[PDB]
Design a protein around this ligand. Sequence first.
Ligand SMILES: [Hg+2]
Ligand SMILES: [Hg+2]
Ligand SMILES: [Hg+2]
Ligand SMILES: [Hg+2]
Lengths: 285, 156
Amino acid sequence: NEAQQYYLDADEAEAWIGEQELYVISDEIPKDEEGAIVMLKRHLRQQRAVEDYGRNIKQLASRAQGLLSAGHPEGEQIIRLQGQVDKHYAGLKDVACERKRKLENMYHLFQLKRETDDLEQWISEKELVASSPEMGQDFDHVTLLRDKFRDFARETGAIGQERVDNVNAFIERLIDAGHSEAATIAEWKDGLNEMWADLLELIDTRMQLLAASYDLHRYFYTGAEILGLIDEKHREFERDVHLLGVQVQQFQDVATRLQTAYAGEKAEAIQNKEQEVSAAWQALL
Amino acid sequence: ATGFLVSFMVDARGGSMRGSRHNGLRVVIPPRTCAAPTRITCRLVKPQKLSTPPPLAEEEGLASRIIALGPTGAQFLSPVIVEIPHFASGDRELVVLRSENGSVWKEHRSRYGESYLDQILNGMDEELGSLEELEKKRVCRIITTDFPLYFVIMSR
Ligand SMILES: [Hg+2]
Ligand SMILES: [Hg+2]
Ligand SMILES: [Hg+2]
Ligand SMILES: [Hg+2]
């Protein structure tokens, strides 16, 4: 009577667990990040349903215990049946966790691979900018090219570093949380961090490149200015000429420093402008 | 020698450079060989990134990564030295290939070679290894006076 009912109810739960384990819960493997999102959402509702059924299972256990403790002749049979409902229910709980572990992994790995591919593609684009051979047609131009690049270097740096940090943190959350693909993920992290370090250097050398171009143009710009000032004095006081002579001494020093960096035709142009400047200066003296 | 990851500045004073990541990769740009401050880049590219990689016959194999030195097409006033590590290795023969613009690969040849090294160095002091020491380390020495887009070590 209470007994007959206990059996009907036990068969019911067993049938319910059977159905969840083999037909409601799924083996599908998500194709992309989007498919994983979908599957994980569906699986968490399903897992919530399994969790709730826990109420029934406990009510059955409490009823069975009541029947055994009441000295019912089938107490042995009833307890054994409950032993089975409990086991099968715990089994269903294991299948659901495992699947959830798997979908979380598949989803994270997808998310991370998108984030990484994008950040790496980004870095590639920024390298291209750093690889510009452009040196500047004239002083006004290099001044601008150098200035624009300093701007580019700082933003590229600021924004890049934040992006790299986030991906590095995301990767550590995954590894530290324990993730079947940690080896691969770490590999990705290494590749990402190297690309970043290379880019920073590439940006840096481009800066040094433009600064050199800047000096070369600054020098030829200064020489012509000086030749004009010397000319204005000739065509024309002692204090003005002295101040000019200090600038000449200064320009000569610059010319020496630069010759050190150039050779062949350019080194000749540098030396030649120095000689021209001293020659005009002597003429004035 | 100071390390680089993929790039460095060099001018007329020259300089000797090794990769921080890969000690055996070395670039020596002797004094008075580079005409201006110039930004040198050097990357080791995987062959399958190239749209046309080196054509190989049956018993041939690549023995390094592709080496991209830049700026592409740079001319020096006198030979520069590059040392590239390679894999252990057919004809137990290593050759250096170069492609100017990336589509055609030819074997690399220099006027100079082994004995001109002292002269090449222009009085700078570096120890370059025994040709036999290089063989033991599994490193090739390339003497070139310009940068092709790519260089590579192969086995024929
Ligand atoms: Hg579970
Ligand atoms: Hg150069
Ligand atoms: Hg390199
Ligand atoms: Hg060799």
